[PDB]
Design a protein that fits this description.
This is part of a larger assembly, with two copies of chain A (about 100 residues), one copy of chain B (about 120 residues) and six copies of chain C. With about 100 residues, chain A is an all-beta fold. Chain A has no helices and eight strands. A six-stranded antiparallel sheet of chain C has the order 1-2-3-4-5-6, with no helix packed on it. In chain C, a hairpin with a 6-residue loop joins β2 (about 15-25) and β3. The chains are: A mainly beta (about 100), B mainly beta (about 120), C alpha+beta (about 130). At the C-D interface, β1, β2, β4, β5 and β6 of C face β1, β2, β4, β5 and β6 of D. Chains C, D, H, I: Its main location: virion. Chains C, D, H, I: One of its GO terms (molecular function) is structural molecule activity.
């Protein structure tokens, strides 16, 4: 199973909502997680089930989708939310990461 | 058909009280007798019921230890012994006559009620 | 449905007698609940049995059966003896696809027929309709 | 008594329905009086049959019997057909020395039981007594 | 089975119709009664089958509902109809009373 | 212990009657103590018997047995004296081993006494309806 | 009645322990209700059983039987789990007739319960000394 | 424990459905408690039955059993009928000396296995493990 | 579905124990995949078997069966010995016309029931519902 991210580059600065999509070559039954990396080079964890949310997330982040199509949604973007976003699956052994997208 | 009650009574804490009753105008033998406690401003509550024929009581699963019900066969009298009175549960106690006809379930002819300190 | 004392008021020919029944557990052999007359002594009292049945490999439909029987005591010794007994039983038979409306209608129809003049004159007096 | 139109009021679960039954004669071969509802098709009628059985040498008891049969129809085709049946059977047994008071008591007790919460839950909701 | 009354307080003075609702945690097959208590502290009986009516009631009171929802209706309210209203069920052993409502 | 008068209070389904039992001596053949209620016509008396296995060095099991019988008298035509119509019996048996301690036996006895006053038994004996 | 949790207080020769019993269902073959005390290792549990003859129209005698057993666990070398060393039993039987009334049965039960707390039985069971 | 309404949340494939089950009593003939869904027709209900079997001389083991039965209906006719069934059965076996920790471990392990990718693929997609 | 190490976290009565299972191939005789506890030694470890079946001339519907069994080791010699074993098995039974929604619903319902208080009190403690 190969994960890919469609945008790969996004320029929306402040205020407007943004979305990041994902595709999987096979069917993964919601076993997907989203990671955020700032310039500190240590990724954080988000969502982790394509619908749930982590402890420290301010709820502006939310994910959805089912089957082979998944997405990440941000409402009321704030300046600290800028960096790289990665996703991976947990359905089979390789646990392949995603392409990545930069804000 | 009316139900006489003694009226207000005052008792010290940690004692027992009789809560007498009297039935007139109807055969005491046939009808159930309910006991209802009304704390001032707290609404009505159901204590239990007794059947004069043979002592066949029902209880709230509360007031099991506090209240016990007995009836004497003649003199048309019913009783309600309160085992322990902390006087925190001070209220007015009524004694309605239960009716159980077909498609007719209610308590009618309640009575005056007695207040216990 | 919780087993509980069941009281029937204003029954009998005159309409003044009352009867109060007390639970007597359920039979674990055949799942038949029992109700017995309050007071009185065993073998000298009125009984009611209610059962509900499940579909099985023999019957594909439900079956509710109510049986009531009550004796008459005659004293000649210290204790009474039974002279005769009067029986009565009901047996509804619904199906697994039946709705609640039909069951309620049948029950209410049976309850209402027993008060009709035809049944009153055909049970109290043992004479048929002509 | 004499067979005549029987009307039943406050029938049904909600208690607002009615039902009228028209006489259909007495069968001489078995002495079963019949009451049916108004309808052209014989298979979609609601029937009530009542009988009284005088004692013989084999049984030496009185046996009053009542039956109820309620069919339901639906158009799956051009005309409706019978989908399912709902039955109900009652029977009473009395001896030669039973007084009318006992028979009336049995009838009224059976009539009053059907309106109690126990039977309402056991028949309508098919919940066994427990 | 637990009975509850929704309004618990009503201020409609004169003329306008009023309603009092009730809810039961289980299904009670119309086994419900309504009680009225004035300042005399001796409750009266009303309705007693959620649809019928008692002898002394002037027919301005009427109830309805089925299943687990029940109500009491008053048409052309008159000054003497002011006090507390209680309801109870008769389906199982406890015969629990209602919360109560004051006019 | 040596037999003495036993007065029991608050007997009866009402909860007010009392009973007074008098010693009736031990039966030498089987060592069964006896108590009876005072009254005329010894055939219409309430009886209690208590039996305990005698202490032995090689005894395996100790058995305690208690019996109760209450007769009812009905006077009938053609006879001057009353007669016993029916009997109401009771029978309590305990069985322990040689290695048991006092606390176990006391716990069993108190548990039985408390059970006999629970609503389950008050219903299953007074009304004779099975528990399900 | 339907089985429910039974909590008994003031058990024990000291007079302070409590016991809580949980229902264990009815045996269909013989209709014996069962209660047990909550705990691990179901082999080391205290058990109570209650049996009543089912109501019949032609039944002569009604028989009520109650049993109690309390096992003791001893851990021994060579075994990981505890084992039952000894048992302490009890057995209560009542026998009435079809014509008996409620008051007789209640009187018998209350009398037995009061006897079990009398000094005679407190001495004849705890100390295992015969009465003479 | 005591039978009461059982509500199940986050059920279904998407994880947003719910289900409420109402008690239907305990059958004394076999000791099988039953929980069903709300519905007039007996044949269109979702049923859950649970039992515990005390050891006897034949088996001398404890046997806890759970069953699930889900019917689906469709109107081909006037009223819906049952098209197909979906079953599910669970059973546990324990000895007289099993400690509660082992039983809890078995129950939780079985609960957690059903949410793993292996079982999700084997049951939902009917793909054999390979 | 690819055979792979399956790890279960936060299981047990306390909720802290974890269990990791390793594949052990598939049986060519009956097509039963096996999983075994990581580490440990044979005949002293936890086992899980998963199988999926195809319709045939005897059965016209699918059948998924999961069996888990695990022993308890007691040391008296150098090596431990098994004292007792606890079993558990599940067997779903769908049909060839069943959709994915129904299979997912049944699986999720079974997973959710095992966490309900009824099953918790009826498996950990071996007492039935009343």
């Amino acid at each position: 199973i190969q994960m890919t991210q469609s945008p790969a580059s996004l320029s929306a600065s402040v205020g407007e909502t943004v979305t990041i999509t994902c595709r999987a070559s096979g069917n993964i039954h919601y076993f997907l997680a989203w990671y955020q990396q700032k310039q500190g080079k240590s990724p954080q964890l988000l969502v982790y089930h394509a619908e749930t949310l982590a402890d420290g997330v301010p709820s502006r982040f939310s994910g959805s989708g089912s089957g082979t199509q998944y997405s990440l949604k941000i409402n009321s973007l704030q300046p600290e939310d800028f960096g790289n976003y990665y996703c991976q699956h947990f359905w089979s052994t390789p646990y392949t990461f995603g392409g990545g997208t930069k804000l | 058909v009316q139900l006489q009650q003694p009226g207000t009574e005052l008792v010290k804490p940690g004692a027992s009280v009789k809560l007498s009753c009297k039935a007139s105008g109807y055969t005491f033998t046939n009808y159930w007798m309910h006991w209802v406690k009304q704390r001032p401003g707290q609404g009505l509550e159901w204590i239990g019921m007794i059947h004069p024929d043979s002592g066949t009581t029902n209880y709230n699963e509360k007031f099991k230890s506090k209240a016990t019900l007995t009836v004497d066969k003649s003199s048309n009298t019913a009783y309600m012994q309160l085992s322990s009175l902390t006087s925190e549960d001070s209220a007015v106690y009524y004694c309605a006559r239960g009716v159980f006809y077909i498609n007719y379930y209610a308590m009618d002819y309640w009575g005056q009620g007695t207040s216990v300190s | 449905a919780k087993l509980e004392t069941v009281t029937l008021g204003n029954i009998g020919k005159d309409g003044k007698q009352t009867l109060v029944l007390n639970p007597r557990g359920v039979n674990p052999t055949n799942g038949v609940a029992s109700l017995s007359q309050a007071g009185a002594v065993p073998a000298l009292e009125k009984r009611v049995t209610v059962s509900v049945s499940q579909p099985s490999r023999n019957r594909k439909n439900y079956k509710v059966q109510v049986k009531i029987q009550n004796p008459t005591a005659c004293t000649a010794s210290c204790d009474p003896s039974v002279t005769r007994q009067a029986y009565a039983d009901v047996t509804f038979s619904f199906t697994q696809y039946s709705t609640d409306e039909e069951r309620a209608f049948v029950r209410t129809e049976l309850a209402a027929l027993l008060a009709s003049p035809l049944l009153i004159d055909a049970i109290d007096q043992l004479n048929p309709a002509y």
